[PDB]
Amino acid sequence: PQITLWKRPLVTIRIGGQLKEALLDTGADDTVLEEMNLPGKWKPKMIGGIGGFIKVRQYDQIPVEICGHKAIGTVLVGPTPVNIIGRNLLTQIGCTLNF
Amino acid sequence: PQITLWKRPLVTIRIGGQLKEALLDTGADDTVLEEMNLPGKWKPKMIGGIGGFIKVRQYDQIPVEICGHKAIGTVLVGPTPVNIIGRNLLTQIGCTLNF
Numbered sequence: 675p676q677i678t679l680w681k682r683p684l685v686t687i688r689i690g691g692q693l694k695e696a697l698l699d700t701g702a703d704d705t706v707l708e709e710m711n712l713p714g715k716w717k718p719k720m721i722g723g724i725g726g727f728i729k730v731r732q733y734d735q736i737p738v739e740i741c742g743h744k745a746i747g748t749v750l751v752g753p754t755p756v757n758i759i760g761r762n763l764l765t766q767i768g769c770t771l772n773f
Numbered sequence: 774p775q776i777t778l779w780k781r782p783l784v785t786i787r788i789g790g791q792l793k794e795a796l797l798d799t800g801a802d803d804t805v806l807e808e809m810n811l812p813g814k815w816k817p818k819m820i821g822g823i824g825g826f827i828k829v830r831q832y833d834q835i836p837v838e839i840c841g842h843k844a845i846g847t848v849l850v851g852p853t854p855v856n857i858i859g860r861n862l863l864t865q866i867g868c869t870l871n872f
């Protein structure tokens with residue numbers, strides 16, 4: 675769909691069987707979600723944002739549905755102010771910026 | 774134009790006659806630029822993201838040129854690692870997310 679930006683681009687995603695709200699974030703290389711229970715092995719990792727670094731758990735080849743569109747990729751779980759969908763998953767669902 | 778997200782959506786912007794690279798960021802509510810000299814009064818402010826908060830200076834009605842498109846809005850200047858063009862200016866150049 676065509677999404678304008680007068681409002682935050684929040685969409686419903688389905689991950690690990692549950693529905694959650696996430697922000698389509700083109701300024702994010704990675705996808706990071708608030709703490710949650712996800713099956714599978716995970717590896718500790720570190721990522722930084724505008725205010726510093728945080729510790730996250732990294733889950734690979736995770737299935738995620740964004741507004742109906744399927745994606746399978748890396749998801750980082752940790753202390754983020756909001757669930758963010760980064761370019762690693764945005765490219766999988768064919769999302770582009772237009773103007 | 775149409776920007777793919779294989780790479781960071783880095784674009785050239787013009788401000789005060791000077792050019793620079795900035796990120797077209799749908800996850801950013803406001804626009805944040807790297808420390809720079811700007812004339813005009815400002816208002817103290819703190820913005821937060823992954824890792825915590827940073828102190829920035831808020832300037833209003835600043836004119837920026839992104840890809841030949843003009844936009845006028847508020848910009849926050851602070852110790853950010855990347856120049857960020859947020860939704861406050863993105864909406865003015867008629868930028869949309871599509872998938």
Ligand SMILES: COc1ccc(S(=O)(=O)N(CC(C)C)C[C@@H](O)[C@H](Cc2ccccc2)NC(=O)O[C@H]2CO[C@H]3OCC[C@H]32)cc1
Pocket residue numbers: 697699700701702703704705706721722723724725755756758760798799800801802803804805820821822823854855857859
């Ligand atoms: C009021 O105005 C604001 C403007 C901007 C922000 S923000 O920068 O914390 N933010 C975070 C978003 C969830 C709000 C926007 C994201 O797109 C923000 C932009 C950014 C900041 C620093 C370095 C590179 C990229 N991206 C971000 O934190 O991405 C994370 C996840 O993937 C990684 O790639 C780049 C850094 C890492 C916060 C407030």
